[PDB]
Design a protein around this ligand. Structure first.
Ligand SMILES: Cc1cc2nc3c(=O)[nH]c(=O)nc-3n(C[C@H](O)[C@H](O)[C@H](O)COP(=O)(O)O)c2cc1C
Ligand code: SF4
Ligand code: SF4
Ligand code: SF4
Ligand code: SF4
Ligand code: SF4
Ligand code: SF4
Ligand code: SF4
Ligand code: FES
Ligand code: FES
Ligand SMILES: [Zn+2]
Ligand SMILES: [Zn+2]
Lengths: 118, 118, 118, 584, 155, 118
């Protein structure tokens, strides 16, 4: 078929027209964060973790809903993108209540999984 | 080399210098494919090449002065953002002094116009 | 970016699915999968803005709604706000090993990954 | 001889309904036959209720009318055959100066017609644009006319209306839709409501012309249910237009067929967004969708949809009648036409104004608005509302123009224009706008859902005197992150008041944070009410007016405040006429 | 009650896009949104109960609890707030001993903040069951509340 | 079974008989997906089903006579190529005699119209 040419993280990729940046990067083993995406569902654009920097666009684009076009240059780990993802994650952690690890595990100097083996 | 072989298929303009297709036939095939995909080919050589068939500009030079004039032309048409180059490069004023007295030819000016427009 | 944090977690009697609002990142995936894939549409958004929560129909317990206990919401959840209870005597977060097999309970022959430890 | 009473949303909020009832009763008891009509807001909202007595072509606008003065007016003008000239506020021969610098296009008929009678609109050059378009004009000709006119937005970010119409027209579909934003959104803007209450037929005709240009067969008006007067007048206008073959099937005895259904909005600032208005119409919760597909390509129920404001639709019949070039000869080289501004806040003369583009904000305030209330100082104008920004006094010369206002960090917006003087805290204003944004956010994306709330928390800490040092740069970083990461325009424009106030009024933030003092003396947790013993006279008014009974003292002896039980409600300043209480 | 909803549901039957209009009519009929009425709307309209609850809790016009006899729409637009409307709301809250959005235990007053009421020139403005009050002041607002209370008690 | 599960996504019309979605929820999801892809769904059952939401025709029958009437209706509209059927099938005349005296209902005629038009 007709193939679009993209540049994701300095790597030239011949992708297929009609895919999103998330799918193209998944195929080429490029990790883009995502929390509200699912291949069975229409895009939602909520979390804002999949934002990538596309050369020629002043605003970061969601990789889950943006489609790859011919002669595209994409950065997925630029400082702007990292700052955006860090701020989104901090906002998400702002409204979060939980224990990733129990206090017993954190009090062990060797961090033995006390809860796990108990 | 600065870039990879794949980016040839996606670049706007290709400048092939020397017997690129003669010494490396597969590179001649790659240039043919890239021009078919939408690139623009400029061949600089001292004789005939198989890449001249689909080239938009063909230059038969024998001296380095052709490039120097080009540089001067690039300065005359204000195609060099000296603010950026001064931060990223040194010896810029020496380059300007070196190429100030050369004569800009029609071929050199056309090459400079092709370069600046890509 | 720390401040007011909701505490809206209530214990539930459901034998299979446990929902914690305090760990919800409001990605909407549970709602979108119950509506778009399962088709039951037992979950929805309640309130608006910072007060937004995910609740079953009319805030009822999952048992009293049209939920069919498929577990798709708990399977799609990214951040442990919807989990499927382990069929064991005491709940313990463990690292499991997954083997693919076939469900034998009807003729649709759906495949599954059974995650075991011991 | 005719009598008109100004029954706008503000007209019945100033006693206009009772004035009309008294006028009718007096006319009936006097055995007189004089028509009595309602009318919209002429823009002099500080003179309501307004009674226009019409003799032939002469109009006399009495203002601040009262039921007690009504019999005198009736017996001296309607019966006495002589203008009273003592309570007269305006007249056709000498109009009010506030109406002399205004060029009116959208508000051409506002306050000068009967909103509940189609014949009055028809008499004043009404529906002739629709007749001309339906008789001897191609839809491409209509789009080209709007393109030449330069109409753009009038209540949005500002986009060429011709581009939206052409995009909707060229799209493929058996059914296309033409929607209208009768929602105001901005808490402090009332231009759309007043236009719908004083000129619904202009909006209807503009919608019909837009449909003819596009090819639509059904249109929707999205008016908030909180505005019953606008809904009632729109329903009356639609019925009257239908009964005259001006709306529905076979309009004006031609193959065109356009109809309008009023879709009442349930109330949400997010619902003003295009992809959220579409969801609200479709019955779902108004959660904004992603940009592809666009409303023009596929909007309501997956069909092409053209969403426009009320004012840009009211502009259309004028453009069609007077030509595109006439509309394009007004304004600047980029923004052309007139813009409607709702002047409010600390202003001497507030209300609806319609100013040509390129007019300086200083001309809008000091020349049209009359200056500042109580002739106090002038600090800033909040242009745009919660999505807009504060243009300070030193940028008062920016012309009314999308580019010029945008260059100052504000936005033109719907057109709300709140003037804040030296007694209004900028940090408090940013906090208020962020509180509104957090209360009206759809809560889908974490940047708007959490970023706005966290910014509000920072501003609350600053206002409450608990603001830790090192919060200005973190507030700026939150604002930039929220602006560049949110999904819809509610979150991408929410940081604008915070971003602007931190550019022109950063010293207020510094004083709130470093010195822990309020330069404007507005934030309760940073001010103090103290009684100077010399100035007090011991009348006991302030002591008796305290909800907390803070101030105690003896008669004819200087009262002493109780700072322990003072809630800083500011009642002392309002009740002490001797200047004894000092805030600092 | 679940009897008056028949004509409202019949005039909007056949389309699952009229649900907000059905909710508005239901709130008009019952003065609030009852859960049994929402169940009936979901059963007849064919819309899922989760979506009904989502719409009912998304919009500000919809209230899930009974609302007292008198509603105090206290405008909180930009013009009123600049003109000192926060103190009016605080005075009303202190006088009625309730928080904004709530109703008095007596079931008589219900303070709700609203956007611009249109009459900016009378800022601050508050509306009580149709009646309007402008150019107010904390003391003045308390006086209006006291006068309404005394006038109703005398009857 | 005559066909495979994949062909469901490509068939013109689906006739789901019984509690297909109730007893097998994944088949209900598959029918939802197939109808979204462009198929037409007809559900025949004695009670309500979750597949009735996107069905173009819903039949609440309690007896086999319905189908018999359908067969008779299929003969009345000349929708049975009796040459081909006689070549490939036996007992055709017995079938015609069996269904000749049944009463064709509106539901049966509509079902026959749907079947013949697919
Ligand atoms: C949060 C938000 C609220 C909005 N509210 C309104 C509104 O109340 N009225 C309006 O005309 N446009 C509003 N808009 C602008 C719309 O996106 C859009 O511009 C408008 O419906 C039509 O644009 P126009 O100016 O070309 O007519 C809003 C935009 C956003 C992001
Ligand atoms: S507490 Fe649980 S849900 Fe929250 S981040 Fe940690 S592991 Fe994830
Ligand atoms: S278990 Fe299945 S049916 Fe129940 S809420 Fe979750 S996704 Fe919906
Ligand atoms: S999938 Fe989990 S995190 Fe996402 S909305 Fe549902 S419960 Fe919340
Ligand atoms: S095979 Fe049948 S019982 Fe097993 S998961 Fe699939 S649908 Fe359910
Ligand atoms: S910015 Fe995000 S959370 Fe805020 S209204 Fe828009 S879509 Fe909803
Ligand atoms: S500010 Fe209010 S509480 Fe304090 S002394 Fe004055 S009237 Fe009393
Ligand atoms: S109102 Fe003023 S003069 Fe009168 S007792 Fe109070 S402080 Fe003294
Ligand atoms: S994955 Fe959440 S915005 Fe794209
Ligand atoms: S802002 Fe309150 S009446 Fe306008
Ligand atoms: Zn007015
Ligand atoms: Zn302050």
């Amino acid at each position: 078929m007709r193939l679009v040419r993209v540049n994701i993280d300095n790597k030239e990729i011949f992708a297929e027209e009609g895919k999103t940046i998330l799918e193209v990067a998944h195929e080429n083993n490029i990790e883009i964060p995502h929390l509200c995406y699912d291949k069975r569902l229409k895009p939602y654009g909520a979390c804002g973790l999949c934002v990538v920097e596309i050369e020629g666009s002043p605003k970061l684009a969601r990789a889950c809903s943006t489609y790859v076009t011919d002669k595209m240059v994409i950065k997925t780990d630029s400082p702007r993108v990292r700052n955006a993802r860090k701020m989104a994650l901090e906002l998400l952690l702002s409204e979060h209540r939980g224990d990733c690890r129990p206090p017993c595990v954190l009090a062990c100097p060797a961090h033995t999984d006390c809860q796990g083996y108990v | 080399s600065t870039n990879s072989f794949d980016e040839i298929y996606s670049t706007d303009l290709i400048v092939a210098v020397g017997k690129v297709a003669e010494n490396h036939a597969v590179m001649g095939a790659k240039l043919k494919k890239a021009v078919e995909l939408g690139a623009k080919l400029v061949t600089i050589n001292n004789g005939e090449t198989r890449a001249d068939e689909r080239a938009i500009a063909t230059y038969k030079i024998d001296n380095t002065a052709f490039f120097k004039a080009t540089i001067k032309a690039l300065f005359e048409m204000k195609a060099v953002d000296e603010d950026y180059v001064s931060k990223i490069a040194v010896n810029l004023d020496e380059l300007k002094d070196d190429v100030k007295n050369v004569e800009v030819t029609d071929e050199a000016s056309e090459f400079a116009k092709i370069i600046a427009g890509a | 970016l720390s401040g007011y944090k909701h505490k809206r977690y209530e214990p539930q009697k459901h034998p299979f699915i446990e929902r914690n609002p305090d760990k919800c990142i409001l990605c909407g995936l549970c709602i979108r999968v119950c509506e778009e894939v399962v088709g039951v549409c037992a979950l929805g958004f309640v309130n608006r803005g910072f007060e937004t929560i995910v609740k079953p129909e009319f805030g009822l317990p999952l048992e009293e709604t049209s939920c069919i206990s498929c577990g798709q919401c708990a399977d799609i959840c990214p951040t442990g706000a919807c989990i499927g209870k382990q069929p064991v005597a005491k709940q313990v977060p463990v690292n499991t090993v997954a083997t693919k097999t076939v469900c034998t309970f009807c003729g649709m022959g759906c495949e599954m990954l059974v995650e075991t430890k011991g | 001889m005719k009598i008109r009473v100004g029954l706008g949303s503000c007209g019945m909020a100033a006693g206009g309904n009772k004035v009309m009832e008294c006028i009718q009763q007096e006319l009936r008891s006097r055995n007189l036959d004089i028509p009595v009509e309602p009318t919209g807001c002429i823009g002099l909202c500080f003179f309501e209720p307004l009674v226009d007595v019409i003799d032939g072509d002469d109009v006399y606008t009495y203002g601040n009318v009262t039921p007690e003065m009504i019999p005198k007016i009736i017996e001296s003008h309607v019966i006495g055959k002589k203008p009273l000239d003592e309570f007269i506020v305006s007249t056709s021969f000498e109009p009010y100066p506030m109406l002399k610098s205004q060029v009116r296009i959208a508000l051409k008929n506002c306050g000068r017609i009967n909103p509940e009678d189609i014949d009055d609109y028809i008499k004043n050059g009404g529906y002739e644009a629709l007749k001309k378009v339906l008789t001897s004009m191609t839809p491409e000709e209509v789009i080209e006319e709007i393109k030449i006119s330069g109409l753009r937005g009038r209540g949005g970010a500002g986009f060429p209306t011709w581009f939206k119409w052409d995009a909707a027209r060229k799209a493929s579909g058996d059914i296309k839709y033409v929607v209208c934003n009768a929602d105001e959104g901005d808490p402090g803007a009332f231009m759309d409501r007043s236009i719908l209450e004083g000129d619904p037929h202009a909006v209807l005709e503009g919608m019909t012309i837009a449909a003819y240009a596009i090819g639509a067969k059904e249109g929707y008006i999205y008016v908030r249910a909180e505005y019953p007067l606008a809904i009632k007048r729109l329903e009356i206008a639609i019925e009257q237009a239908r009964n005259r073959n001006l709306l529905g099937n076979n309009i004006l005895n031609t193959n065109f067929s356009f109809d309008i259904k009023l879709k009442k909005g349930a109330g949400a600032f997010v619902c003003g967004e295009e992809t959220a208005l579409i969801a609200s119409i479709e019955g779902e919760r108004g959660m904004p969708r992603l940009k592809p597909p666009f409303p023009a390509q596929s909007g309501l129920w997956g069909r092409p949809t053209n969403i426009n404001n009320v004012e840009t639709y009211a502009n259309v019949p004028w453009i069609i009648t007077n030509g595109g070039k006439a509309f394009a000869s007004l304004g600047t080289e980029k923004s052309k036409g007139t813009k409607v501004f709702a002047l409010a806040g600390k202003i001497k003369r507030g209300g609806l104004v319609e100013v040509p583009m390129g007019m300086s904000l200083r001309e809008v305030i000091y020349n049209i608005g009359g200056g500042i209330k109580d002739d106090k100082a002038f600090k800033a104008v909040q242009m745009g509302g919660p999505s807009g920004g504060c243009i300070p006094a030193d940028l008062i010369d920016t012309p009314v123009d999308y580019e010029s206002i945008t260059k100052t960090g504000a936005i033109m917006g719907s057109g709300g224009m709140i003037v804040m003087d030296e007694t209004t805290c900028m940090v408090d204003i940013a906090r208020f706008f962020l509180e509104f944004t957090c209360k009206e956010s759809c809560g889908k994306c974490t940047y708007c859902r959490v970023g706005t709330r966290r910014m509000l928390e920072i501003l609350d800490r600053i206002c409450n005197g608990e603001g830790r040092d090192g919060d200005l740069e973190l507030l700026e970083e939150l604002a930039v992150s929220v602006k560049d990461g949110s999904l819809c325009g509610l979150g991408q424009t929410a940081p604008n008041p915070v971003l602007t106030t931190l550019r022109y009024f950063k010293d207020e933030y510094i004083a709130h944070i470093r010195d822990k003092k309020c330069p404007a003396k507005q934030c309760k947790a940073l001010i103090t009410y103290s009684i100077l013993p010399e100035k007090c006279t011991g009348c006991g008014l302030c002591a008796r007016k305290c909800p907390t009974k803070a101030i105690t003292g003896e008669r004819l002896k200087p009262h002493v405040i109780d700072q322990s039980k003072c809630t800083k409600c500011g009642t002392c300043m309002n009740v002490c006429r001797f200047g004894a209480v000092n805030v600092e | 009650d679940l009897s008056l909803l028949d004509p409202v549901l019949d005039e909007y039957k056949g389309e699952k896009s009229n649900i907000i209009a059905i909710l508005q009519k239901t709130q008009e009929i019952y003065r609030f949104l009852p859960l049994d009425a929402l169940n009936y709307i979901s059963e007849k309209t064919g819309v899922k109960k989760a979506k009904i609850y989502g719409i009912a809790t998304f919009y500000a016009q919809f209230r899930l609890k009974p609302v007292g006899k008198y509603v105090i729409l206290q405008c909180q637009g930009t013009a009123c707030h600049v003109n000192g409307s926060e103190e009016i709301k605080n005075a009303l809250c202190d006088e009625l001993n309730i928080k904004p959005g709530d109703t008095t235990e007596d079931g008589m007053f219900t303070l709700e903040e609203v956007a611009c009421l249109g009459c900016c020139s009378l800022a601050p403005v508050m509306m009580i069951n149709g009646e309007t009050y402008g150019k107010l002041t904390p003391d003045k607002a308390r006086e209006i509340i006291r006068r309404i209370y005394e006038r109703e008690k005398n009857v």
